[PDB]
Amino acid sequence: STPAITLENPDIKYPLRLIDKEVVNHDTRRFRFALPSPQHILGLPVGQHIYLSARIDGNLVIRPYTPVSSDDDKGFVDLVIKVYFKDTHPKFPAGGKMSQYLESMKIGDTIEFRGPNGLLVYQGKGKFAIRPDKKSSPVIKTVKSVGMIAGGTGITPMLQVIRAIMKDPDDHTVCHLLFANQTEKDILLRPELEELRNEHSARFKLWYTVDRAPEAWDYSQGFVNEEMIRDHLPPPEEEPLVLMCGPPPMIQYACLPNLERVGHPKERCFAF
Ligand SMILES: Cc1cc2c(cc1C)N(C[C@H](O)[C@H](O)[C@H](O)COP(=O)(O)OP(=O)(O)OC[C@H]1O[C@@H](n3cnc4c(N)ncnc43)[C@H](O)[C@@H]1O)c1[nH]c(=O)[nH]c(=O)c1N2
Numbered sequence: 001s002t003p004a005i006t007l008e009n010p011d012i013k014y015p016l017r018l019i020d021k022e023v024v025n026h027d028t029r030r031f032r033f034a035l036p037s038p039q040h041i042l043g044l045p046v047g048q049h050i051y052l053s054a055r056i057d058g059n060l061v062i063r064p065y066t067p068v069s070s071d072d073d074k075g076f077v078d079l080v081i082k083v084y085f086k087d088t089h090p091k092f093p094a095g096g097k098m099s100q101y102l103e104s105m106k107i108g109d110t111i112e113f114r115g116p117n118g119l120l121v122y123q124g125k126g127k128f129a130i131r132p133d134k135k136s137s138p139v140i141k142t143v144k145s146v147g148m149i150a151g152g153t154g155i156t157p158m159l160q161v162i163r164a165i166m167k168d169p170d171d172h173t174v175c176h177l178l179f180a181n182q183t184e185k186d187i188l189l190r191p192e193l194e195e196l197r198n199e200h201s202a203r204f205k206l207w208y209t210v211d212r213a214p215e216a217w218d219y220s221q222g223f224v225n226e227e228m229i230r231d232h233l234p235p236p237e238e239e240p241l242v243l244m245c246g247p248p249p250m251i252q253y254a255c256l257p258n259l260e261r262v263g264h265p266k267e268r269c270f271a272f
């Protein structure tokens with residue numbers, strides 16, 4: 001056989017039950033939901049995401065989230081979601097709609113999932129199928145190495161790709177991750193990230209930057225910049241694919257101009 005698929009139709013919404021919530025850090029959690037049976041798999045190609053939907057305060061709210069589990073996982077899906085709390089930030093008194101709804105869910109509550117979605121699919125052994133837009137067919141890019149620039153929760157699609165590569169011992173793709181967060185305590189999934197480094201150092205290069213660094217710091221500090229991209233992503237001549245995911249200003253000002261500066265062409269770059 002093959003396992004039963006959860007996301008059988010992309011227009012159907014599937015209500016899934018919350019079964020566990022794990023702290024990632026002060027504002028971020030790992031939400032685990034049960035699939036329709038313990039034998040199901042989600043049905044999500046590597047690189048793709050889902051959407052959650054709920055009527056919040058009387059209005060339908062839809063938001064994408066990027067699972068960090070895979071179709072090898074029977075019976076569950078894991079999401080890693082930053083909660084934007086109310087009554088905290090001076091510019092955002094109300095906080096975030098969906099993220100707080102999720103934070104408020106009790107174990108056994110359901111939320112609607114739909115998918116899969118996204119223009120990139122990792123097909124294994126260095127092959128990426130990337131559509132230029134939703135209305136066009138994919139084109140298949142094989143590379144030997146992948147640069148990854150993530151900011152905050154932009155780690156989630158990167159972790160999906162990294163995990164897929166590392167579990168296949170005949171996948172020789174080398175991933176170079178440059179991960180940016182506001183402070184050291186904001187780093188997400190550090191432990192997990194570090195264990196990948198431990199076990200896969202020939203295939204996985206890891207570097208951090210933080211907007212503000214502690215006195216004890218051995219990594220970079222500040223927004224992603226030209227130097228960091230040279231030093232911590234594969235060079236242009238190696239013809240890598242460069243993946244990027246993070247806040248819109250991060251992409252616009254930190255990533256795009258500096259990728260030009262180093263010489264990574266737009267055709268070998270992809271923003272989630
Ligand atoms: C394709 C794709 C995939 C993903 C994601 C985006 C996209 C385009 N996201 C982001 C996610 O879809 C969603 O935008 C956020 O969860 C925020 O939605 P809310 O409804 O909570 O905030 P809402 O839409 O109400 O917006 C509020 C905004 O105000 C700001 N804000 C509010 N309170 C704040 C506070 N206390 N501190 C700082 N800023 C504050 C934030 O910028 C926040 O986004 C994500 N997210 C995630 O956590 N994990 C994931 O895997 C993904 N996956």
Ligand SMILES: NC(=O)c1ccc[n+]([C@@H]2O[C@H](COP(=O)([O-])OP(=O)(O)OC[C@H]3O[C@@H](n4cnc5c(N)ncnc54)[C@H](O)[C@@H]3O)[C@@H](O)[C@H]2O)c1
Pocket residue numbers: 049066082151152153154155156157180181182183186210211222223224245246247248249250251253254271272
């Ligand atoms: N498209 C996708 O697939 C996808 C998936 C996951 C997350 N995301 C996005 O990633 C973002 C994660 O937000 P967050 O709250 O975790 O991030 P954050 O505000 O904590 O910022 C994380 C890092 O982004 C960089 N950044 C932020 N503002 C910048 C600026 N003005 N100039 C340069 N760099 C800047 C900094 O390096 C910073 O440490 C969200 O916008 C979310 O929608 C997108």
